[PDB]
Amino acid sequence: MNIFEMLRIDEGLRLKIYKDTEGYYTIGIGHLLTKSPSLNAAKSELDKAIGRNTNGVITKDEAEKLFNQDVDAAVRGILRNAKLKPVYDSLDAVRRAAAINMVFQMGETGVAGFTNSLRMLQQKRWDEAAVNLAKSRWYNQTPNRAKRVITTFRTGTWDAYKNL
Ligand SMILES: [Cl-]
């Protein structure tokens, strides 16, 4: 298991434009295209991302290319964020994957507002951190995914993904 396999499980793989859990146009392995309700706007974002006129369909190779870029972007975002970087640096590699997963899903700003959870994570108060993380819109809207990510933070193991 690693961050790529982890996010592949959590996000799935779809080669045609679809709507994510929030109703936003998305493609590949959870590549958000736009929050706009316009399909044409989403197709435009897709073409710009891929570098060709796609009309809403991409290949597996293309989906994986965007995925790699997105994972890179999430890590880079954590490292450039004053609130997130110290907490991330404080973590072991397994829990770092859980951190990247969160940022991948909700963005740097969204995660950076988990102030109390972040403190508990840096303190290595794993059970307390886990309890706090679940007190969120995030957990309520995507409980099964959040539960996996939280278990990863709580245990520092891949137990929540090992079977799937
Ligand atoms: Cl389409």
From Swiss-Prot:
It catalyses: Hydrolysis of (1->4)-beta-linkages between N-acetylmuramic acid and N-acetyl-D-glucosamine residues in a peptidoglycan and between N-acetyl-D-glucosamine residues in chitodextrins. Changing residue 11 to A/F/H/M/N: Complete loss of enzymatic activity. Endolysin with lysozyme activity that degrades host peptidoglycans and participates with the holin and spanin proteins in the sequential events which lead to the programmed host cell lysis releasing the mature viral particles. Once the holin has permeabilized the host cell membrane, the endolysin can reach the periplasm and break down the peptidoglycan layer. Pfam families: Phage_lysozyme. Its EC number is 3.2.1.17. Optimum pH is 7.3. Coiled coil: none annotated. Changing residue 26 to E: Complete loss of activity at neutral pH; covalently bound substrate. Substrate binds at residues 32, 104, 117, 132. The lineage of its organism: Viruses, Duplodnaviria, Heunggongvirae, Uroviricota, Caudoviricetes. The gene is E. GO terms for cellular component: host cell cytoplasm. Keywords: Antimicrobial, Bacteriolytic enzyme, Cytolysis, Glycosidase, Host cell lysis by virus, Host cytoplasm, Hydrolase, Viral release from host cell. GO terms for molecular function: lysozyme activity. This is Endolysin. The active site is at 11 (proton donor/acceptor), 20 (proton donor/acceptor). GO terms for biological process: cell wall macromolecule catabolic process; defense response to bacterium; peptidoglycan catabolic process; viral release from host cell by cytolysis. Changing residue 117 to V: 50-fold decrease in enzymatic activity. It is found in: Host cytoplasm. Changing residue 132 to I: 5-fold decrease in enzymatic activity.
